[PDB]
Amino acid sequence: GSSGSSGYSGSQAPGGIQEIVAMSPELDTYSITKRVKEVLTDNNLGQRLFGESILGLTQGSVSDLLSRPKPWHKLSLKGREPFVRMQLWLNDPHNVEKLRDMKKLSGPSSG
């Protein structure tokens, strides 16, 4: 048999990116930007689109992010916000699938 009582439950969270980022380990901004660029180049993707759909960033802002990332320590949680989404977007196996699907097929542009 047994007797007594033990265990518990009853907690929740608000959610949101900044709380994922809060819990995050040191996400090597450089190595992520590197791997992210290389994923864009492999798939011949355009930096902006990734920045729009994933990061909510202007192309100026995304291209600066990839070009010269600040270190994780320098970045506040709002600083780390995009790089966390990049780390997870690298791990997501249908990441590029959903990203191409934004553009899908389009009509002709230039010659």
Is residue 111 a part of any domain in this protein?
Answer: no
Q: Which long-range contacts (CB under 8 A, 24 or more apart) does 23-30 make?
A: 24/80, 24/84, 26/72, 26/73, 27/72, 27/80, 27/83, 27/84, 27/87, 28/72, 29/69, 29/70, 29/71, 29/72, 29/75, 29/83, 30/69, 30/71
Is residue 11 a part of any domain in this protein?
Answer: no
CATH number of 69's domain:
1.10.260.40
Report how this structure was experimentally obtained: NMR
Domain count, the chain: 1
Q: Are 43 and 96 in contact (CB under 8 A)?
A: yes
Neighbours of 8 (CB within 10 A): 5
Give the structural domain span for 54: 16-104
Neighbours of 44 (CB within 10 A): 7
